[PDB]
């Protein structure tokens, strides 16, 4: 009867449906949960909005062409302007959350291509200028549009639409895909929670992320706990006559969200 390909996820007033899934990854076999008293430090009663923030938010879609190199989003940064979650993020000095990420990309049984969907905890990026330069806030907190690696990649060496937000401007991150933007190799990214969207097999990837950090709760605007990466390993191959592109959509839903230290809105650069 039931299969691992057909799944339904319901969070708040939103529901995700999939008929071509490949099971679902729960990071380190840990489901998200609220902060227990035994691990708490901050004495303030936390705020748990529940269904008003723990729901699915769909980001802007991306276009996967043969020249694509990859995309990168940072959480909770990617959701900073998303409904009540974003608002709570700016009014509180502290917060913690888990997530359920859902990456979508459908095609036909004539298409070829493979996407690596990986979640990297504490993904500290390298600077484009190299040596002893630090990445400026703007580039390290790109928002819902994320970072397009195709602006200056490693694999075939291209410069798609940009080089960065405007162009190669002081403080941008090194966009070499093969080096994971941090001096390690792409092939080893599999040590982190991941799934593949192999067009011949599945059309979605689902990863549930618990709160991962060395502190019980943390500043949400100054720290990005995880980084979501979508990278084309096997290039996109469309059938004869078809458009050489395919859309990719990302939908994220915060889970077990807690907020603390409420004051006025946060002052961030840009």
């Amino acid at each position: 009867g039931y299969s691992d390909r057909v799944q339904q996820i319901t969070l708040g007033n939103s529901t995700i449906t999939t008929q071509e899934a490949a099971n679902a990854v729960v990071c380190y076999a840990e489901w998200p949960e609220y902060l227990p008293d035994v691990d708490a430090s901050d004495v303030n009663k936390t705020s748990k909005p529940d269904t008003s923030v723990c729901r699915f938010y769909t980001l802007d879609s991306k276009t996967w062409t043969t020249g694509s190199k990859g995309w990168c989003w940072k959480l909770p940064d990617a959701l900073k302007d998303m409904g009540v979650f974003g608002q709570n993020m700016f009014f509180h000095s502290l917060g913690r959350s888990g997530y359920t990420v859902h990456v979508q990309c459908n095609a036909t049984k004539f298409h070829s291509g493979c996407l690596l969907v990986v979640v990297i905890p504490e993904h500290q990026l390298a600077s484009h200028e190299g040596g002893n330069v630090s990445v400026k806030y703007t580039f390290t907190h790109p928002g819902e549009r994320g970072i397009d690696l195709s602006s200056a990649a490693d694999t075939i060496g291209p410069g798609r639409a940009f080089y960065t937000t405007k162009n190669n401007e002081v403080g941008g991150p090194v966009k070499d895909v093969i080096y994971n933007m941090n001096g390690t190799l792409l092939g080893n990214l599999l040590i982190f929670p991941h799934q593949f969207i192999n067009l011949r097999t599945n059309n979605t990837a689902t990863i549930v992320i618990p709160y991962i950090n060395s502190v019980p709760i943390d500043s949400m605007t100054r720290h990005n706990n995880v980084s979501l990466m979508v990278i084309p390993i096997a290039p996109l191959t469309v059938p004869t006559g078809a458009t050489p592109s395919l859309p990719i959509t990302v939908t994220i839903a915060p889970m077990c969200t807690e907020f603390s230290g409420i004051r006025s809105k946060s002052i961030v650069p840009q």
Partner: protein
């Protein structure tokens, strides 16, 4: 046997013996059995 007040002074802790790779090798939601079809 006992000549140090702080625990940081002691030597190595020794082997854990509780090494389970599951959380890294099989962090999937639905139970995947070896031998059964990966995806029904």
């Amino acid at each position: 046997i006992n000549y140090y007040k702080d625990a940081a002074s002691t030597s190595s802790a020794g082997q854990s013996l509780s090494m389970d790779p599951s959380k890294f090798t099989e962090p999937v939601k639905d139970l995947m059995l070896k031998g059964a079809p990966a995806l029904n």
